[PDB]
Design a protein around this ligand. Structure first.
Ligand SMILES: O=C(Nc1cncc2ccccc12)[C@@H]1CCN(Cc2ncc[nH]2)c2ccc(Cl)cc21
Ligand SMILES: O=C(Nc1cncc2ccccc12)[C@@H]1CCN(Cc2ncc[nH]2)c2ccc(Cl)cc21
Ligand SMILES: [Cl-]
Lengths: 305, 300
């Protein structure tokens, strides 16, 4: 029993965290095989960040300008290239701790674990979701740039995020491991704002199924709804539309609990129009949307890595 | 900016997780140097759960009864001993991945990270607090016994918990790494119940300071209170008494935000009286009590 916000074990990623220093800027790098990946803004000054030409700044750099430190060992940079908003520093040594890995770009609503690092040293791990507005509500201070987001598939690490910046609202923006930003963001000191956020509906439903598996049933009702009627209500409360793909993904939880997805949608509809009435679900007074249907199955069935 | 429930990176602990099998029972063990630590109930059968005599059961066991598996390698048990509710299995190989470590027994209110394991394999990491009733509100299934709770101090792992059982309410009970249970619990199937839980007041205050550091100030008021008047109010909401030790511990956060502890106590009393009124604090509609003053300073 119990339901917690749970991250993947971070060990396979900890062995890849290195410190990257370029001039006065120090941030984190991901060392996989003989390449260290990090945000390309490491080559910037405070003036450069205002309106940067990264090709012109990088062409002025030499390999010896980048100081890469893995633990108490300095790696020697033998090449440098840029892929979108990520800098790739070729090193002479392949990371012996390199796990089986993939670079994957995730969709909004998908969750992943963040290994927050400072000076190439892992300080914490937390689970979060890529919001529908493409920001992540992370926890990061200055020095955390280059911290990575990941999932674990059997024994394969899927790297899906690299932290680049904090928006004025305190939310975070970053890229996949190919340097492509999630969202309409750029890596420059300019006026940027996150769009209005919405609730990840499929994840709320998956969390309601986790509550039922844990014995919380007060919110269940006799009612069902059409997918269309549910979406009209959901859209009114800034909830993401629930697609037939989402209904199919919730299939196993629906079969396990005996509550059809559209039957759980009617519970969610009433929760939205009426509130919780001083009650909680899994010790929460708000509907939790940072657990995917896969996370719920993984936690309520004990899948290991 | 931002405030998250954050666990310590679990890598140093993952390299110590092994599978321990004794007869039909399989659970997790912690392999440090040449010793594998696990709950002693791994030696129990069906008739040995209501009233087990662990000394009697362990004396009947031999080293070859214990199957220890680290990854796809079987370790050879060369000795066995019992320390309180923990079984110590001496093995013929020292764990090369053994980190710098300490065994620390924590107090209620303290937080730690849990590396939940099944069959000696880590499946997830999450953050817990030792509740004032000495239980932990974990997320554990059958097979998770031997999963450990820990904190990391620079590069040193302080092991503070080993999971032993689930109480009828779905909460969890375990021991420190010396086998001493937290709480009035025993490793028997006898009728056991967690005491009435209370909110960790010092942690709620630390979390209110984290909210102020993050820019959330709506809950602040012009009032202050005496420690005694705060405790009389707090007790009525099932909140733990706030001691002078707690007030002293909140000193650095009080100095950083400019809000005296007793001033923040008055904000907490007002929240307990009014509720949140559709508002949230750090994205939460409830007062969070699983962040200690030390966690808040570290994260902020
Ligand atoms: O925002 C940044 N990273 C950080 C990541 N996570 C949390 C943070 C919390 C506090 C401070 C910084 C955080 C960095 C440093 C700050 N500034 C602003 C700027 N102005 C001139 C040069 N840098 C910018 C602007 C754009 C970009 Cl891509 C990156 C950055
Ligand atoms: O409770 C236990 N671990 C578990 C840990 N975490 C989550 C769980 C979820 C579901 C089932 C078991 C969980 C273990 C195995 C079961 N039983 C209860 C029992 N023993 C004989 C008859 N019923 C006992 C009893 C005492 C002790 Cl010390 C340990 C244990
Ligand atoms: Cl599924």
């Amino acid at each position: 029993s119990g339901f917690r916000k749970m991250a993947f074990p971070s060990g396979k990623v900890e062995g890849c965290m290195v410190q990257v220093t370029c001039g006065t800027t120090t941030l984190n790098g991901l060392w996989l095989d003989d390449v260290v990946y990090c945000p390309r803004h490491v080559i910037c000054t405070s003036e450069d960040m205002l309106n940067p030409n990264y090709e012109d700044l990088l062409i002025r750099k030499s390999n010896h300008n980048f100081l890469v430190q893995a633990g108490n060992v300095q790696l020697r940079v033998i090449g440098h290239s840029m892929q979108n908003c990520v800098l790739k520093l070729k090193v002479d040594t392949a990371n012996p701790k390199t796990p089986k890995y993939k670079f994957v770009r995730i969709q909004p609503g998908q969750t992943f674990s963040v290994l927050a690092c400072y000076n190439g040293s892992p300080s914490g791990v937390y689970q979060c979701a890529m919001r529908p507005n493409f920001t992540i509500k992370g926890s990061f201070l200055n020095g955390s740039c280059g911290s990575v987001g990941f999932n674990i598939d059997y024994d394969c690490v899927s790297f899906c995020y690299m932290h680049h910046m904090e928006l004025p609202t305190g939310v975070h923006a970053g890229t996949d491991l190919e340097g492509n930003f999630y969202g309409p963001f750029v890596d420059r000191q300019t006026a940027q704002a996150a769009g209005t956020d919405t609730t990840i509906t499929v994840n709320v439903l998956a969390w309601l199924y986790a509550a039922v598996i844990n014995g919380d049933r007060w919110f269940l009702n006799r009612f069902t709804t059409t997918l269309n009627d549910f979406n009209l209500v959901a859209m009114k409360y800034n909830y993401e539309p629930l697609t037939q793909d989402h209904v199919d993904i919730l299939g196993p939880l629906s079969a396990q609990t005996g509550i059809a997805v559209l039957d759980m949608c009617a519970s969610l509809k009433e929760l939205l129009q009426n509130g919780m009435n001083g009650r909680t679900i899994l010790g929460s007074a708000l509907l939790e949307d940072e657990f995917t249907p896969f996370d719920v199955v993984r936690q309520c069935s004990g899948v290991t890595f």
